[PDB]
Amino acid sequence: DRSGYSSP
Amino acid sequence: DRSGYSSP
Amino acid sequence: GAMGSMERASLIQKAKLAEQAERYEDMAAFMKGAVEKGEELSCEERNLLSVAYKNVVGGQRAAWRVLSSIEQKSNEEGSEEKGPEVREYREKVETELQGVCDTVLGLLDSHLIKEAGDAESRVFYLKMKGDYYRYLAEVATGDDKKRIIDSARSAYQEAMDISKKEMPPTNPIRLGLALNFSVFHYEIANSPEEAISLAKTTFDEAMADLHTLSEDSYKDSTLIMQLLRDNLTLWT
Amino acid sequence: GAMGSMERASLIQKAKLAEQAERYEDMAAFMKGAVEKGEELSCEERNLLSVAYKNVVGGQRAAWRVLSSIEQKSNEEGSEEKGPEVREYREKVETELQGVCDTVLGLLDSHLIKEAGDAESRVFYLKMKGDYYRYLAEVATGDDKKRIIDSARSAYQEAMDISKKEMPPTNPIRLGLALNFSVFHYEIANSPEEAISLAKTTFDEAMADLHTLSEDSYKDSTLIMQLLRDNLTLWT
Ligand SMILES: [Ca+2]
Ligand SMILES: [Ca+2]
Ligand SMILES: [Ca+2]
Ligand SMILES: [Ca+2]
Ligand SMILES: [Ca+2]
Ligand SMILES: [Ca+2]
Ligand SMILES: [Ca+2]
Ligand SMILES: [Ca+2]
Ligand SMILES: [Ca+2]
Ligand SMILES: [Ca+2]
Ligand SMILES: [Ca+2]
Ligand SMILES: [Ca+2]
Ligand SMILES: [Ca+2]
Ligand SMILES: [Ca+2]
Ligand SMILES: [Cl-]
Ligand SMILES: [Cl-]
Numbered sequence: 001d002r003s004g005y006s007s008p
Numbered sequence: 009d010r011s012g013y014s015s016p
Numbered sequence: 017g018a019m020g021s022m023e024r025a026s027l028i029q030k031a032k033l034a035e036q037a038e039r040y041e042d043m044a045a046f047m048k049g050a051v052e053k054g055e056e057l058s059c060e061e062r063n064l065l066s067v068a069y070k071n072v073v074g075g076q077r078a079a080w081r082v083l084s085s086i087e088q089k090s091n092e093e094g095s096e097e098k099g100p101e102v103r104e105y106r107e108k109v110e111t112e113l114q115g116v117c118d119t120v121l122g123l124l125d126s127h128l129i130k131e132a133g134d135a136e137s138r139v140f141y142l143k144m145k146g147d148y149y150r151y152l153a154e155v156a157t158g159d160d161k162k163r164i165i166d167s168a169r170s171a172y173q174e175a176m177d178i179s180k181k182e183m184p185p186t187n188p189i190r191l192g193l194a195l196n197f198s199v200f201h202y203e204i205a206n207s208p209e210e211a212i213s214l215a216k217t218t219f220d221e222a223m224a225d226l227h228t229l230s231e232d233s234y235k236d237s238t239l240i241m242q243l244l245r246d247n248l249t250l251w252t
Numbered sequence: 253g254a255m256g257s258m259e260r261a262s263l264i265q266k267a268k269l270a271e272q273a274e275r276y277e278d279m280a281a282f283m284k285g286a287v288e289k290g291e292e293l294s295c296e297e298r299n300l301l302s303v304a305y306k307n308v309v310g311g312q313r314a315a316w317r318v319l320s321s322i323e324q325k326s327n328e329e330g331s332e333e334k335g336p337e338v339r340e341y342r343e344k345v346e347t348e349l350q351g352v353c354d355t356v357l358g359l360l361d362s363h364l365i366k367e368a369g370d371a372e373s374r375v376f377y378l379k380m381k382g383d384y385y386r387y388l389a390e391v392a393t394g395d396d397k398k399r400i401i402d403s404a405r406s407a408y409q410e411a412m413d414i415s416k417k418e419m420p421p422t423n424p425i426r427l428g429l430a431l432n433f434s435v436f437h438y439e440i441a442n443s444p445e446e447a448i449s450l451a452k453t454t455f456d457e458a459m460a461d462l463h464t465l466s467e468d469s470y471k472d473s474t475l476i477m478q479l480l481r482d483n484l485t486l487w488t
Contacts, residue, residue, distance in 0.1 A: 002081075003250060004199045004211075005243045006147075007192035010317075011486060012435045012447075013479045014383075015428035029337045033322065037315040039345070079273040086269065101265045109275070 019049025027053075031064050040071035044116075051123050056131055062140050069120050073151055076113040080155060083109055110155050117148045124148075135182035136189060142175035143193045146200065153204050165204060172197040185221040186229060191240040194218040195247070202251060212251055219244045255285025263289075267300050276307035280352075287359050292367055298376050305356050309387055312349040316391060319345055346391050353384045360384075371418035372425060378411035379429045382436065389440050401440060408433040421457040422465060427476040430454040431483070438487060448487055455480045 019027060027050040034043035047065045051057065057065065083106040089095060090102055124145050132138040149168035156164050176197060179190040194214060202211035222241050226234055255263060263286040270279035283301045287293065293301065319342040325331060326338055360381050368374040385404035392400050412433060415426040430450060438447035458477050462470055 002203055004202055004247045006196050006199050007240065007243070010439055012438055012483045014432050014435050015476065015479070026335070026337050029334075030341050033319065033338065033341050036322070037318040037345070038311075039315050042341075042344075075274075079275050082273040083269065086272070098265075099262070101262050102269065105266050105269050105278075108278075109273070 017049060017052050019045065019052070022049060024050055024053045024055065028061060028064070031068065035064070035067065040068055040075075044068035044072050048119065048123065051128065054127075056137070057128070059136065062137065065123075066140075066144065069116065069148075073113060073116050073120075073148075076109060076116060077151060077154065080106065080109050080113060113155065114152060117152050120148045121145065135178055139175045139179045139183065139189050139193060142171050142178070143189070143196065146172035146175065146193075147196055150196070150200055150204055168200060168204065172200060184225055184228070185218070186225045186233070186237040188236050188240055191218065191222060191237060191244070195240060195243055198244070198247065202247075208251060212248065215244045215248050215251075219248070253285060253288050255281065255288070258285060260286055260289045260291065264297060264300070267304065271300070271303065276304055276311075280304035280308050284355065284359065287364065290363075292373070293364070295372065298373065301359075302376075302380065305352065305384075309349060309352050309356075309384075312345060312352060313387060313390065316342065316345050316349060349391065350388060353388050356384045357381065371414055375411045375415045375419065375425050375429060378407050378414070379425070379432065382408035382411065382429075383432055386432070386436055386440055404436060404440065408436060420461055420464070421454070422461045422469070422473040424472050424476055427454065427458060427473060427480070431476060431479055434480070434483065438483075444487060448484065451480045451484050451487075455484070 022030075027046045031043050031046040031050070034040070034046060043064070047061075047068045050061065051065065083102065087102045087106050090098060124141055129138070129141045129145070132141050146168050149164055149171060153161060153164045153168055172193070175193050179187070179193055183190045185191075195218070198211045198214040198218070200211075201207040201214065219241055222237060226237065229237060258266075263282045267279050267282040267286070270276070270282060279300070283297075283304045286297065287301065319338065323338045323342050326334060360377055365374070365377045365381070368377050382404050385400055385407060389397060389400045389404055408429070411429050415423070415429055419426045421427075431454070434447045434450040434454070436447075437443040437450065455477055458473060462473065465473060
């Protein structure tokens with residue numbers, strides 16, 4: 001669930 | 009010269 | 017402010033040095049000092065601000081997650097009572113994280129957003145506002161939580177509305193905004209379908225516009241598109 | 253002390269949590285608080301103290317090296333003048349590093365070393381004294397430098413004398429002391445031949461004693477022996 005990638 | 013390993 | 021006596025240009029120079037040295041707390045303090053000079057930030061300077069605080073809060077978030085997981089396990093049946101220390105130390109880290117988020121939000125409110133008229137700057141700052149409310153939401157418990165979640169949502173939505181009107185679908189700021197708003201939907205707002213729809217639509221509209229781009233712009237846009245794809249693969 | 257109101261056992265518990273969270277500045281502050289309770293430290297607690305400060309000073313040393321290299325390049329012929337900022341920021345990092353070293357040395361002097369009677373504890377602390385003077389020496393300029401170098405040397409030599417009399421040649425503390433004193437010789441004291449001799453003699457005497465060890469002790473000793481070998485390979 002929390003493993004989603006946000007902008008680097 | 010400075011690349012020598014010290015204790016971890 | 018401890019940076020009030022230092023020249024703006026010297027603060028920016030030292031922020032860059034701090035980045036090279038991986039001294040991100042220093043980098044953030046230099047950039048806060050630069051913002052507090054009162055002048056608008058250039059594109060490069062906005063990126064320095066973002067990188068600095070992202071790295072500081074990222075370390076805090078990672079630490080919080082470690083501590084929260086230990087605390088949750090302590091509260092399972094059959095777990096031996098160990099006293100207040102895990103909760104206390106989780107709370108310490110949490111309070112420091114909230115403080116960094118409040119500092120960033122404060123810079124945005126006084127007065128970065130109100131002075132930002134160009135789409136690139138306004139979208140950048142509104143995305144940051146959404147992001148730092150999102151980090152507050154990750155640690156919030158209650159309906160306190162509800163108002164924080166709504167603040168994140170509102171900031172992201174205003175940024176999205178501007179970006180769709182004013183920027184091409186391949187613009188990296190627009191793409192990173194959509195990526196982060198999709199994560200908000202999935203992780204915070206309990207809206208996985210909205211998250212998936214947004215990531216898909218964003219990817220597809222960017223793919224259709226890549227033909228307009230130079231080699232270097234193509235590389236910048238496709239990097240972020242890959243992150244959208246990675247999330248879609250995790251989520252579907 | 254900010255930790256004066258917290259129980260000793262709670263400080264130790266929180267140091268362990270901070271290690272798991274990779275919060276090494278917090279870990280160090282907890283361990284400083286524990287030392288200042290005035291009781292001697294157990295083996296485990298000595299290791300927590302060491303790990304905490306090693307990680308803090310290690311980040312500072314790495315940052316200092318980055319900044320020093322930029323400063324040296326600025327002073328080459330043909331380099332454009334960029335003002336005082338690189339020197340100032342190197343000096344800031346340097347002063348913070350020196351402060352951490354002075355804090356550790358102060359704990360050792362008040363009163364860890366004087367209360368340490370067993371060989372394992374006394375050697376441990378004297379090695380730490382040598383190490384933190386070595387880190388001071390890395391950034392020192394002058395004959396100020398000479399007295400710092402001599403302080404490191406003296407601490408290491410007292411530790412070596414005890415370790416040779418009281419500990420087997422495979423003991424991990426003894427091995428890590430010899431490793432670090434050899435690095436002192438090579439990097440600080442301009443004595444590469446002494447460094448190589450020490451590393452060789454230490455490796456060979458440990459190899460001859462491995463037959464006495466359990467499987468788990470063998471693993472602990474051979475790990476450090478490999479570092480001696482790695483240095484010999486770099487240096488010869
Ligand atoms: Ca995530
Ligand atoms: Ca070295
Ligand atoms: Ca000025
Ligand atoms: Ca203005
Ligand atoms: Ca039990
Ligand atoms: Ca307890
Ligand atoms: Ca709280
Ligand atoms: Ca403006
Ligand atoms: Ca007590
Ligand atoms: Ca005593
Ligand atoms: Ca020139
Ligand atoms: Ca300058
Ligand atoms: Ca200095
Ligand atoms: Ca004693
Ligand atoms: Cl705490
Ligand atoms: Cl500075």
